[model samples]
Target chain A: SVINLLFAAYTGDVSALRRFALSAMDMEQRDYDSRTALHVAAAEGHVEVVKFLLEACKVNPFPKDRWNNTPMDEALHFGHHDVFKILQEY
Target chain B: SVINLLFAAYTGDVSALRRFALSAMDMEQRDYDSRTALHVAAAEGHVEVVKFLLEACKVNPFPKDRWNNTPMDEALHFGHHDVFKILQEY
Candidate 1:
């Protein structure tokens, strides 16, 4: 129960993200804010985690959170350049 | 694979939806169109599946599809009375 995978994305470790990817941990699971880990990682400026979600998970990048904000929108608002780039490119 | 669980919601078969619920499936995971199982259920007028998602899954009912449409919008568009009622009440 210690593994909050959503928060793990906030950590940007990529290790826990890998474990979640490998262990059927539902990488696309959303947080209470109606935001997925991609939104969490992007909002927190975690480029690697964002990359993992895009490249490895191949998740839909266009999902909007509760406020009608996409992950790219989060990255843009937070000034996370690399995160925004990856979300934009993929 | 992405739409398998979503297709279950369209089937109106609680058995498959239940199996997905018990499995490692991410209930909020979007299809290529960024639509969740709730959207599929609401669109298809599957009241039981919708009830299951709202009650048993306890998932966020306010999620928007890629078209920026909520499940209630789907129900309304499809003219599903019971589904619209359920989506509205919840």
Candidate 2:
């Protein structure tokens, strides 16, 4: 349901994530799979969502997975050209 | 049948490869695919061939592919356990 998605987003939520940055919440509240919302958003090639998550949410730019793959790596590996371009600035 | 195989080996021939390093041949004699006989031997998991190639023919230990993957990365990516081990020392 939205709970999982929301929790997923919240843990990685830009505004919610910002609270951690601002000391309003604990940084540990985020997922450690290194699967930030940006990772998922980039992997799925979610352009609009990525923009929203990046500009509005403020997710970290360089979260690497256990495989040592970055969001840009995931985008490139999956042939997400547009996403890769967007992530270049991200 | 061994012609292509031999050619593959010859182009990346360890002795020939050694010549390149020793100044008897141009390193350009090999491929920019960065694939060497050692890479093929390791990826195909040819243990005896790898041993012969490493000990006798003298393939390079660290030829990187177009993807920037090393022989070890190829071995690991393709699940070539024995090859991976043999290459660990190559």
Candidate 2 on A1-90: residue-level lDDT in tens?
A: 222332434234445544444553332222322345566656666676567666755666677853477778877886878989988985
| lDDT for residue B22 in candidate 2, whole number 0-100 | 60
* Candidate 2 overall lDDT versus native: 0.56
How high is the TM-score of chain A in each model? Answer: 0.90, 0.64
Could you list the iRMS of every candidate?
A: 11.6, 22.0
What tens digits encode model 2's per-residue C-alpha lDDT throughout B1-90?
A: 222343434344455444444653322222323345565656656566567666754557777854577768867876889978887874
List pairs with backbone clashes in candidate 2.
Answer: A14-A57
Docking class of 1: incorrect
Q: What DockQ, on C-alphas, does every prediction get?
A: 0.03, 0.01
lDDT of 1 by residue, B19-60 (tens): 888886778877534678888788788888999999999878
The candidate that achieves the highest DockQ relative to the unseen native structure:
1
Alpha carbon deviation, residue A74, candidate 1 (Å): 25
Where does model 2 sit among the CAPRI classes?
incorrect
User: Which parts of model 1 have CA positions greater than 4 angstroms off?
Assistant: A1-90
Cα error, residue A6 of model 1, in Å, equals 27
